Design a protein around this motif. Structure first.
Motif, mmCIF file in Angstrom:
data_model
loop_
_atom_site.group_PDB
_atom_site.id
_atom_site.type_symbol
_atom_site.label_atom_id
_atom_site.label_comp_id
_atom_site.label_asym_id
_atom_site.label_seq_id
_atom_site.Cartn_x
_atom_site.Cartn_y
_atom_site.Cartn_z
ATOM 1 N N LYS A 1 0.818 -1.216 0.000
ATOM 2 C CA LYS A 1 0.000 0.000 0.000
ATOM 3 C C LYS A 1 0.850 1.264 0.000
ATOM 4 O O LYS A 1 1.711 1.431 0.865
ATOM 5 C CB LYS A 1 -0.952 0.023 1.194
ATOM 6 N N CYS A 4 1.076 7.375 -0.121
ATOM 7 C CA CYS A 4 0.373 8.524 -0.688
ATOM 8 C C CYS A 4 1.262 9.716 -1.038
ATOM 9 O O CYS A 4 0.750 10.736 -1.497
ATOM 10 C CB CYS A 4 -0.773 8.993 0.221
ATOM 11 N N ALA A 7 1.005 10.384 -4.709
ATOM 12 C CA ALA A 7 -0.260 11.052 -5.013
ATOM 13 C C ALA A 7 -0.209 12.521 -4.599
ATOM 14 O O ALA A 7 -0.687 13.389 -5.318
ATOM 15 C CB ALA A 7 -1.412 10.348 -4.325
ATOM 16 N N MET A 8 0.380 12.802 -3.426
ATOM 17 C CA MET A 8 0.510 14.170 -2.966
ATOM 18 C C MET A 8 1.394 14.933 -3.907
ATOM 19 O O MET A 8 1.016 16.058 -4.301
ATOM 20 C CB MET A 8 1.126 14.181 -1.571
ATOM 21 N N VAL A 11 -0.534 15.920 -7.115
ATOM 22 C CA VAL A 11 -1.554 16.928 -6.864
ATOM 23 C C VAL A 11 -0.932 18.322 -6.765
ATOM 24 O O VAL A 11 -1.380 19.259 -7.423
ATOM 25 C CB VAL A 11 -2.368 16.586 -5.588
ATOM 26 N N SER B 1 -8.401 -1.923 6.039
ATOM 27 C CA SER B 1 -8.705 -0.666 5.348
ATOM 28 C C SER B 1 -8.072 -0.599 3.953
ATOM 29 O O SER B 1 -6.901 -0.907 3.781
ATOM 30 C CB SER B 1 -8.245 0.537 6.184
ATOM 31 N N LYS B 2 -8.849 -0.171 2.966
ATOM 32 C CA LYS B 2 -8.373 -0.050 1.591
ATOM 33 C C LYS B 2 -7.410 1.125 1.419
ATOM 34 O O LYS B 2 -7.530 2.132 2.117
ATOM 35 C CB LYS B 2 -9.570 0.186 0.681
ATOM 36 N N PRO B 3 -6.468 1.014 0.464
ATOM 37 C CA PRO B 3 -5.642 2.182 0.133
ATOM 38 C C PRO B 3 -6.515 3.289 -0.450
ATOM 39 O O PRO B 3 -7.405 3.008 -1.259
ATOM 40 C CB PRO B 3 -4.671 1.652 -0.927
ATOM 41 N N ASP B 4 -6.271 4.523 -0.019
ATOM 42 C CA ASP B 4 -7.051 5.662 -0.462
ATOM 43 C C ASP B 4 -6.355 6.959 -0.075
ATOM 44 O O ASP B 4 -6.204 7.256 1.103
ATOM 45 C CB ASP B 4 -8.432 5.624 0.186
ATOM 46 N N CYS B 5 -5.941 7.741 -1.059
ATOM 47 C CA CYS B 5 -5.180 8.947 -0.746
ATOM 48 C C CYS B 5 -6.046 10.192 -0.823
ATOM 49 O O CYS B 5 -5.537 11.307 -0.890
ATOM 50 C CB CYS B 5 -3.958 9.070 -1.665
ATOM 51 N N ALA B 8 -5.411 12.905 2.015
ATOM 52 C CA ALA B 8 -4.081 13.517 1.920
ATOM 53 C C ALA B 8 -4.003 14.424 0.705
ATOM 54 O O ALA B 8 -3.449 15.505 0.772
ATOM 55 C CB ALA B 8 -2.985 12.441 1.854
ATOM 56 N N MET B 9 -4.578 13.990 -0.415
ATOM 57 C CA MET B 9 -4.585 14.800 -1.618
ATOM 58 C C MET B 9 -5.357 16.062 -1.365
ATOM 59 O O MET B 9 -4.947 17.125 -1.880
ATOM 60 C CB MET B 9 -5.241 14.021 -2.751
#
Lengths: 73, 75
Positions: A1, A4, A7-8, A11, B1-5, B8-9
């Motif tokens: 996983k 992020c 992803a950050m 963005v 819990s699933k990955p999900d950004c 944070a984004m």
């Protein structure tokens, strides 16, 4: 996983490019208005240089005629 | 819990909102400041010109009066 961070980073970059084009278009507007207000502010550049010179000329003329009259009286 | 950004984004978008708005405000203030300076300068020029002109209006009348004094005196 993923943590992020990828992803950050994507963005931030996306919002960074678009925001910069918006700023630029805003500055282009400000610069065009500046050019306008600058023309206006300097509209009478020449007339002012000549009015000032004309004043000096006249003072000296008056002063010289004043001395002529005195020499005559 | 699933990955999900998602969350944070979104915090990143909100942080860069402030940044963008800051730069836009920096520019507005710098340009509005220059715009008032050009207004001051135009009025200064216009009043400088007016006072100059009035000087010459006054001197001109003096030239005329004195030229006739001179003429009457020489003969």
């Amino acid at each position: 996983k993923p943590d992020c961070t990828a992803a950050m980073r994507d963005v931030r970059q996306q919002y960074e490019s678009v925001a910069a084009k918006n700023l630029q278009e805003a500055e282009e507007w400000y610069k065009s208005k500046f050019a306008d207000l600058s023309e206006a502010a300097n509209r009478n550049n020449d007339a002012l240089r000549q009015a000032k010179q004309e004043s000096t000329e006249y003072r000296r003329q008056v002063q010289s005629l004043t001395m002529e009259v005195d020499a005559l009286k």
